[PDB]
Amino acid sequence: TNKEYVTCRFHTVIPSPQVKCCGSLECKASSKADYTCRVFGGVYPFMWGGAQCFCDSENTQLSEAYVEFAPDCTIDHAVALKVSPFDHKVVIRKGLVYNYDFPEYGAMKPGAFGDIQASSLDATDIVARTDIRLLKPSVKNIHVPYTQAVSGYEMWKNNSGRPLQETAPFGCKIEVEPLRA
Amino acid sequence: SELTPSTNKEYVTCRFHTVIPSPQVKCCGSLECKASSKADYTCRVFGGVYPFMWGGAQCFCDSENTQLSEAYVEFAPDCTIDHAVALKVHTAAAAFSPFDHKVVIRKGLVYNYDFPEYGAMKPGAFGDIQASSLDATDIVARTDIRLLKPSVKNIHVPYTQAVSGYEMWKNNSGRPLQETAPFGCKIEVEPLRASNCAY
Amino acid sequence: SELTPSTNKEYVTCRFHTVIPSPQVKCCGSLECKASSKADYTCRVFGGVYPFMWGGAQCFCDSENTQLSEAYVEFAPDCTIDHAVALKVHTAAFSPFDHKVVIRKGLVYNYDFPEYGAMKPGAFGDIQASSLDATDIVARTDIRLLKPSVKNIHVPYTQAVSGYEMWKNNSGRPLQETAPFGCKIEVEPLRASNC
Amino acid sequence: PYLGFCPYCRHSAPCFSPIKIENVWDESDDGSIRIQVSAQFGYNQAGTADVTKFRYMSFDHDHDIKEDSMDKIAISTSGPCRRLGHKGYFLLAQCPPGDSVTVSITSGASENSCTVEKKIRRKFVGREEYLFPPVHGKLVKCHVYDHLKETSAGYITMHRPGPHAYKSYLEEASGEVYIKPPSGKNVTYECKCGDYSTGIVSTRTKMNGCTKAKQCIAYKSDQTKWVFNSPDLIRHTDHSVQGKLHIPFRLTPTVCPVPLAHTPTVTKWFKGITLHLTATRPTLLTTRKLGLRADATAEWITGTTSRNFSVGREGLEYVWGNHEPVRVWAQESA
Amino acid sequence: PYLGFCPYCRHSAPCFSPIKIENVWDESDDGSIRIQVSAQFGYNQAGTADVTKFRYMSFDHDHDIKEDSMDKIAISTSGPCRRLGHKGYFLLAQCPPGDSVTVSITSGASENSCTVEKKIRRKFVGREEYLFPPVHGKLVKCHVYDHLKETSAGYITMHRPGPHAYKSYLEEASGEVYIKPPSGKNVTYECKCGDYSTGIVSTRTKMNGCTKAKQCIAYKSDQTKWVFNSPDLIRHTDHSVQGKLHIPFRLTPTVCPVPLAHTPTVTKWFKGITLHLTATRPTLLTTRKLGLRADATAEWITGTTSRNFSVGREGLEYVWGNHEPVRVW
Amino acid sequence: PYLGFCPYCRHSAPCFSPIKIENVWDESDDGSIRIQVSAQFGYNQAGTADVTKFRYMSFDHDHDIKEDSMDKIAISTSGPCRRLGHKGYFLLAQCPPGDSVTVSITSGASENSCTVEKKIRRKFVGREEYLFPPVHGKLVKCHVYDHLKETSAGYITMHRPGPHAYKSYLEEASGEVYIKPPSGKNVTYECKCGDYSTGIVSTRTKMNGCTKAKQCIAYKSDQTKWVFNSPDLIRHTDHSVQGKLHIPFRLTPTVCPVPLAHTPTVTKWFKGITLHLTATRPTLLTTRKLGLRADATAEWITGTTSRNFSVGREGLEYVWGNHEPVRVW
Amino acid sequence: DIQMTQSPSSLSASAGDRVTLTCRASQAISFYLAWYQQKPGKAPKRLIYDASELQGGVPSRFSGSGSGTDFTLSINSLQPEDSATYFCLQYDSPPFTFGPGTKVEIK
Amino acid sequence: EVQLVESGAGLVQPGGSLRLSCAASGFTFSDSWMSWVRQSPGKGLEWVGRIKGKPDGETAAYAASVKGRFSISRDDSKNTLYLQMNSLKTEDTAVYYCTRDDRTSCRRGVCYAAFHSWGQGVLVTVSS
Ligand SMILES: *[C@@H]1O[C@H](CO)[C@@H](O[C@@H]2O[C@H](CO)[C@@H](O)[C@H](O)[C@H]2NC(C)=O)[C@H](O)[C@H]1NC(C)=O
Ligand SMILES: *[C@@H]1O[C@H](CO)[C@@H](O)[C@H](O)[C@H]1NC(C)=O
Ligand SMILES: *[C@@H]1O[C@H](CO)[C@@H](O)[C@H](O)[C@H]1NC(C)=O
Ligand SMILES: *[C@@H]1O[C@H](CO)[C@@H](O)[C@H](O)[C@H]1NC(C)=O
Ligand SMILES: *[C@@H]1O[C@H](CO)[C@@H](O)[C@H](O)[C@H]1NC(C)=O
Ligand SMILES: *[C@@H]1O[C@H](CO)[C@@H](O)[C@H](O)[C@H]1NC(C)=O
Ligand SMILES: *[C@@H]1O[C@H](CO)[C@@H](O)[C@H](O)[C@H]1NC(C)=O
Ligand SMILES: *[C@@H]1O[C@H](CO)[C@@H](O)[C@H](O)[C@H]1NC(C)=O
Ligand SMILES: *[C@@H]1O[C@H](CO)[C@@H](O)[C@H](O)[C@H]1NC(C)=O
User: Fold this and answer.
1) D253 CB burial (10 A radius; 0-12, 13-18, 19+)
2) Among the atoms of ligand 5, which is closest to the Cα of residue D202?
3) Which of H102, H106, H107 sits opposite A24 (nearest CB)?
4) CB contact residues (below 8 A), chain D span 206-235, against chain A
5) What residues have CB less than 8 Å from H3, skipping those under 6 apart?
6) I need a surface site. Which of C1, D112, E12, F17 has the fewest CB within 10 A?
7) The CATH number of domain F4-159+245-257, selected from 1.10.238.10, 3.40.50.2300, 2.60.260.20, 2.60.40.3200
């Protein structure tokens, strides 16, 4: 077996919103996982002070969106391998073996298994396609609105079915680290 | 393009509030049934009750203890907004009409639902109350209000009642005509019309 | 009309009280299971368990510290009201009753209960005694005692659900609205009125 | 503030309580519930309206009006409901879903609670269920209870009290009956021990010819109080219309936010479209054709799934939740 | 007032608590429950019956007996339960529906609690389900728990307490064992370091030939108490019957209120009838013919609908809820 | 700490609260959740570690930091939740599930809370679900949140706060904007009343060329404070990483007890078996053949029933709950 | 190459009335349309970028909305220094194509 | 305010070369995208080319008819925009503009920018 990628539940984190509400703001393209830059117009934001915006008109808003691993991902994660009761594409999840046909590395599909991809749990070269987009804020105080499809890891968890330890025929128990029958 | 019919209001309906007047007790005389103009007015004579409020004796002469109870129905206070209006529609100026002959409007959501005529009363169905206006005193109703004989020592009037046919129709209204009318057009109210409807 | 049969009482049944006797431990010796005449008496002997009570000590021998696990049942204390009594009928003085009838709180059922001694657990009739106060209770409710796993003392048991409650769930409708020919069933004594 | 026969008192059985709920209104879109109670809320003893204290009917034999404060009342269905407004005979509260509504006064160690049956269920506005109003969303039409108490939603009708008899006014001793009025309060009595007889006394007075305690009725002449048309009291003989007081907490038409669901991803094939949906909550999808036949399909969609819809030349319009209606037309790419 | 191995103690894990629920009874038709607890309620220090305060043993190595009061007991399943009555090993409480039962003593900050499993289901009597007993209805025959406290539903049996050893009765010093009993009371000691040896001590006593603390035991002779047959406690050698308390709060018969549904509207047709029904709650309809085959049909009805039944010449009987069986031909 | 836009305040509408749950995780096998708020616990006014009390943000215009005792904090989802641990920003909770999570402070008569959406459920480990882990059963592999607070499951990043401006810092009188800083704290300022103008001032000073009160912005430079990278606050112009704080209460591996179901009665029939099962709770039964075709079946069975499986010469294998594999031919 | 259409091309009107101008895109641009205007003999000036939000430097009577292939340019009041030729640009893929324009004049 | 001035245009021989200048001032020059705008008499507006910033590598895109013939050469030391155009055809007689592009969205790395600033425009005549 060789390791293509690992996947787990992604953590939705948003940097703090820039409003310099007289002149335009410029963002920078970053190598973050599923990094997105958008600029937004007139919101005239409020904080607890209630007045953070000189030039009540002319407003510009900056917001960024990216995903990164949830802090529990060193335990609750799935490993995708390619390798007989084993199919050509197998999925390892906490000692349970599933013969899922996961998408290839670089071919991310939102709302499905393997929507976020990285080589290791500590790897910084994370790629993701979660179909995240930014919406125009309408309420008078400051916030970021965003809509996004659900985690395909949790949806695949729901429809995983039985693992290969009860699926593989000829009465043999699948054992993990390394994969074997 | 606005297609509006000729509209006239037949009655307005909502969920009905069963108000109960306080019962009155003749000691051991005889009370009689008096006819009223209230909606679904029902009155009758029972025999001995011997009521109990706090002291154990609200009434002497225990045998032949006739008690007269009253019950009628009128408009609930929240029906000024939460109400359904019955309407007749006529020819509207290959002619096409998305509306049926009978139409029901509620909260802007429009329904081409068959409703009974004024006075053709149905218990447990739509139109269980009919009146020309919300503040009109000419309320008419026939929702099959039947009362029961009290048996417990205390004074209390019992009744069994059918469920609100307004509430039953609200559970089973189905899809309103705004998103099922053919030729792709939203239905807008005040006045009732169809906007930008291609045919 | 009074169509009444001649009936006899076979047994009574109700929910069971699974009482457990207090476990006994030979600290450093050996035990043999005895043979009592209780209802579903089941006693089997284990090895060294080394139990604790509150201060972390009950015996002085890490091995040969055997334990006696005991379990049996009787009637539950509420059984003088919510109990079902098995009756068998004869020629009645057409009969709407079947050959085996069950009475419970005035409701009569035409249920084919197993006979006195033909016992499998998990269904109706899982407890038999001749009367409510009868001490010759016999039962077969597949009680099995397991080995204690945690260091603190307990006796575990895995046992089936109440066949009385299962039959109650799968009761159906009584013969007061099930017997034909418009016959009103009444009790004390068992009879069919206005048939 | 009369006393009513509550259908469920504190222990198990129905009894007479001054906090009886007559009926329950739960038509507001936000999930607020306004309660008619048989006590008066927001007035002192003399009649001056003050927020911090209310009045009720006291558990004693002269039926004087006794007063408690706001901090000892409670509303609950399954958890504790919070109070938002109160005026006169009525309440308003925000409540979790349940099967019944309660009011309860906590007079130290003396607890009195009334509970009435009402199937309260959570309700929403729009085409998808939502628990709390979101930060982001478009704005649609809703109707809420008005939080200000100086508004009128209708008129309630109340009249004069009837003859409300007690047992403490009359006692039987040595084969004779007696009537004991309180200090300075004239009390009417009426009885039948032979011929009919009425009478008004203020002091302790004997009645001749009476030997049974169940046979006479004594009650105070109470003109200065008004009682609502409840079925738990004996009415006066002249039960004509006398006064109308307001119903606060009107349904006001206002604006409400609803969330945005996930916009579907379009898949194109020949004379038909496949829609891929993601939805954490059930959201309504309404499709209709743009020709002679509407062909309406109705479904509540939860989770992630895919729906196939056939599209003709005349067109098709699908609305996903509260979104703007998207109309689509099929080409002839065979 | 003993302590058992409660399956759900205060945080998460099982532990030994003096308020363990041993067995649970919920067969009354109003939904109240009798909780049988490891402690006993309603007795003072000398054992004189008083309502205001109760028994438990505490978490110390003398296991002597202290008192708390009625205002510190709390019973809950999903919401708080109201207390109905108490003597000794038994309770009574009216509870909301839930999945498990829980009693608790609130000793200041000591939130001592025990929880066992009993899936409590709300139940009714009759042929109509109801949230509350109505103010109007017929008077029928169900069964209630008795509120009178000196009733008797059965009996329980108790025996003498067994060996309750401790480790603080011993102490280890320089590879040797010593027995330190509490002052003023005699403590039975037993130890095995080769030959089997018993005896009695009352003061500071040296035992020879022993190196570790895991092979000697000690317990005071407690024959002045009675203990129930609980499965979490060791027993005495002579395990004979030595006592009998009653089981109060007996299931007693009474009269019972049930509601009545609306009378259906009957529509007649040729060899058949039509039932125009309204019912806000699930109610039972049982129908039968008067012929050779009874044709027993029974269904539970929610909402409003219309049912058609064919009526033969022999006749038909329908029972709508708890109403009288109305006979037709 | 920082203050943000809570999605649910007291009456009906969202507002600002100091105790926002930005996110909440629920992956632990006992149902325990970990809760962060914007404020920190376990620290005093200066920041020294003190368990009994915490600090939070004041509701005034000088925006100082106050402190309160931790005995007044309350956490609830449907009923109240029991507190287990705390370190800085974080909590942890254990309670039966609800549709939302609440943390609530009761500062006398001033009660403040915050509520966000999370669909927490009752989770199990093994093959049968269970209300509480029983006294007896197999010890299987499970993952739980650690009780010990000196753990590290990751890191979060903190950056400098931005311009936290106020309306009370400006005053409007006679058509001229005045800015009054507080005593001893310089407050810088910036606005467009014509050309670009920037300075720092600590005293009430007049300002030229301004006509409307909302035209200008004043804020104090708090560079001695660290705030979490939240989407509800303003950050500094240099958004560089400058510190990392741990994630305590790691998902630690341990052993958990699970219940064992009743051992079924096997009825042997010619090339077929019958499983006589009893189950109070739903128990997973999974079978497969020992041949070329697995013929795998899985059902979740409630109550008592019987299941029939045909048995071939290659053999069959079934697992009943958490029991060991049982093989037949 | 992505083709730009500009309909209509002659929408002369008066002050304060209702004028709606559209710029259809051929392929599915999400929201990347920028709105321009041209004084005669002067430099161009941007009005609305990202097709929904108002750029700083312009009054609040200009507004736009739309996504996909149809977009709008809603003018609240035709104050008489709005006499210009309005332009629309896509900035999604190369080459960036300008519309032919609409000569709006006020007399 | 961003100042953009054009200079260096005039009457030249067809099939030759010239060098014009757009001196950019008023912004951070090292991280801004520069584009060029061409206007025809009788036709609409035409795009010429785009260049990127210093972290991108100063790469250059171009239109269909200007590939291999136009050369944009930026320099950060003096902050000006140059255009080395060669092989002047008869379709290059136009009025040119130099623009500044601020980026509005960087969806998954690639940045899409509109035309923010503008010059006054200078006219070039390629005839004989
Ligand atoms: C909806 O329509 C699509 C086609 O647009 C169906 O997809 C086909 O599915 C079958 C079975 O998997 C495949 O053999 C075809 O190759 C698929 N076509 C393509 C190219 O997509 C899909 O099954 C339909 N879903 C339903 C029936 O709801
Ligand atoms: C998971 O999948 C099942 C179908 O197998 C579906 O019923 C369920 O709603 C999905 N999600 C949940 C809530 O588990
Ligand atoms: C409404 O009708 C539908 C379909 O019969 C039913 O499922 C639903 O429970 C009804 N709701 C009520 C409360 O009437
Ligand atoms: C009881 O009987 C019903 C009959 O429909 C069945 O559905 C149910 O599973 C049985 N079990 C229990 C205890 O409810
Ligand atoms: C009651 O009425 C009688 C007759 O009017 C009068 O004499 C008596 O003083 C009154 N008592 C009082 C003070 O109410
Ligand atoms: C201890 O034992 C001695 C000898 O039997 C006896 O005299 C003494 O009273 C006992 N003390 C007690 C009962 O604690
Ligand atoms: C019942 O009979 C009526 C009247 O003939 C008929 O309209 C209706 O369809 C019948 N309903 C059923 C369920 O058979
Ligand atoms: C800032 O305030 C300090 C006193 O707190 C003062 O010493 C310092 O000079 C001030 N800085 C400025 C504005 O110069
Ligand atoms: C299974 O088969 C046995 C005979 O092999 C039969 O007794 C039993 O009823 C059957 N059960 C089912 C559900 O088929």
Assistant:
1) exposed
2) 11
3) H102
4) none
5) H23, H24, H25, H26
6) C1
7) 2.60.40.3200
